[PDB]
Amino acid sequence: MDIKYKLASYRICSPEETFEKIQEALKKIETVEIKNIQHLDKVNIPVYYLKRRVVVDGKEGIAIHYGKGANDIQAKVSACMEAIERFSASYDKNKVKEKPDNPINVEDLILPQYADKNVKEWVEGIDIINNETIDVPADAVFYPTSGKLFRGNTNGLASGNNLDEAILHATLEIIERDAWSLADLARKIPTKINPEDAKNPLIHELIEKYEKAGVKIILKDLTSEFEIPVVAAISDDLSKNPLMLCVGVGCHLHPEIAILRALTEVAQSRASQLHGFRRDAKLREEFTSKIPYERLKRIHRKWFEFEGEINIADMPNNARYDLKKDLKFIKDKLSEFGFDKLIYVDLNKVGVDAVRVIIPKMEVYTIDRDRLSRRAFERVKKLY
Amino acid sequence: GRLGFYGYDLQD
Ligand SMILES: Nc1ncnc2c1ncn2[C@@H]1O[C@H](COP(=O)(O)OP(=O)(O)OP(=O)(O)O)[C@@H](O)[C@H]1O
Ligand SMILES: [Mg+2]
Ligand SMILES: [Mg+2]
């Protein structure tokens, strides 16, 4: 059991140690400030930002990264490790191969109708299901990208305390967004989670923080075929502020970690909205604030309504508090359901483990509406 | 349009 921190983090070392270890990396990425923004909201849940210096072709600018957690250090490390993950993802010509030795079938990535299928830039990865090297498009690895094959996105990027930690996290994120994609397609999301039987004290603390703030939380089960918990936490503010209709989605082998991640992400979504620094937050502030509250509740009906309730005790728990064993389990479940490749690319750039994970055939529709496979509809039918 | 969310960037 290499997972030493089980209660909130599911990591090999403490957040305090992570923060100590990444100090050099944080200067290398040109960090300008790291701040807590809890005060913007009424829920008293830790949310951090990190701002870093960026040059977008000509002008100097700022990139922002948000962090979430049950306590202060977790939220701060979350922001820092997102910033490092995202910095590590930028295009690196030293990794580019022009002639692919063993190219993936690019169709399996689920391509938009406008995809330029003439890939000129390839990157080598390791398929850890089949234990072989494989070449994947650069557009599927780096961020940002030229956007030739598809629009660049951050799905399956992760940093961590070691290689396996980053791989596990990025894999869980792929699983998360695939499941979220299926939920977005589904006409109904029938199953509510009652968190009363949580063994983890931090779930109760978080739920109670929302109640006192007059924020109604509903938990929805999005768990897909793999029996890897995916949970949506949806906030409904008694203030009827349309901008406070927010979702957080958590994914983990342990259902209580998934719930913790969903609950803290809700606070993160709310706080980044209220911060209004990001382009999407600013635009949501401008346009969605004019959308009547009752229209939004009506549009997103399926998220709030429910046909049945389960307990956490009803949810699968295949966590073993050991990275290699957890990865083994996931590999088996992916293979079992025809997801026969689990590919990672090493993106370590500033002395911190960072990867891209690619699991061909996993859906990204929730991020990019232009990408949706024929097989998603049957999957939705089966689960929902 | 959408519910508020956080966790990814997508280029336009
Ligand atoms: N204590 C920690 N030690 C090492 N890496 C961490 C730690 N906390 C967060 N990270 C990393 O920071 C980044 C953001 O993590 P966070 O906990 O915010 O989950 P997330 O990736 O936002 O989850 P989701 O996939 O649901 O968006 C990830 O790359 C993650 O691996
Ligand atoms: Mg999420
Ligand atoms: Mg992430």
* A44 Cα distance to chain centroid: 22
DSSP A369: T
In whole angstroms, what is the distance from residue A355 CA to residue A368 CA? 21
The answer to whether the CB of A342 falls within 8 A of the CB of A357 is yes
Query: Touching check for A145 and chain B: CB below 8 Å?
Result: yes
The answer to whether the CB of A22 falls within 8 A of the CB of A79 is no
Residue with structure tokens 């969903």?
A: A262
- Solved using: X-ray
The answer to whether the CB of A184 falls within 8 A of the CB of A383 is no
Query: Touching check for A265 and chain B: CB below 8 Å?
Result: yes
Residues 6+ apart with CB under 8 A from A301: none
For residue A234, the chain B residues in CB contact (below 8 A) are 3
**Token duo for residue A112:** 């938009």
Q: Determine the distance in angstroms separating the CA of B10 from the nearest CA of chain A, rounded to an integer.
A: 4
In whole angstroms, what is the distance from residue B11 CA to residue A373 CA? 20
Closest CA to A361 of A331, A338, A383, A327: A338
DSSP A127: E
C-alpha distances in Å from residue A170, one per residue of A173, A252, A307, A327, B10: 5, 11, 32, 11, 16
In whole angstroms, what is the distance from residue B2 CA to residue A300 CA? 8
User: Nominal resolution in Å?
Assistant: 2.0
Residue A167 Cα to ligand 3 midpoint, Å, equals 11
Residue of B1, B5, B6 lying closest to A288 (CB–CB) = B1
Residue A295 Cα to ligand 3 midpoint, Å, equals 30
A268 lines ligand 1 (CB under 6 A): no
In whole angstroms, what is the distance from residue A47 CA to residue A24 CA? 23
A173 lines ligand 1 (CB under 6 A): yes
Q: Determine the distance in angstroms separating the CA of A86 from the nearest CA of chain B, rounded to an integer.
A: 10
Give chain A's largest Cα–Cα span: 59
**Token duo for residue A16:** 């305090």
Contact A303 B3 (CB under 8 A): yes
**Token duo for residue A25:** 């990396």
CA-nearest residue for atom 18, ligand 1, is A78
Residues 6+ apart with CB under 8 A from A47: A36, A37, A38, A41, A66, A67, A68, A75, A267, A268, A271, A272
In whole angstroms, what is the distance from residue A178 CA to residue A264 CA? 20
Contact B1 A245 (CB under 8 A): no
**Which conformational region is residue A57 in: left (phi greater than 0), alpha (psi within -120 to 50 degrees), or beta?**
left
Q: Which atom of ligand 1 is nearest to the CA of A5?
A: 1
Residues 1-12 in B contacting A (C-alpha not used; CB under 8 Å): 1-12
DSSP strand pairing (A47-56 vs A59-68): antiparallel
CA torsion, ordered A15, A199, A48, B7, to nearest 10 deg: 100
For residue B9, the chain A residues in CB contact (below 8 A) are 86, 143, 153-154
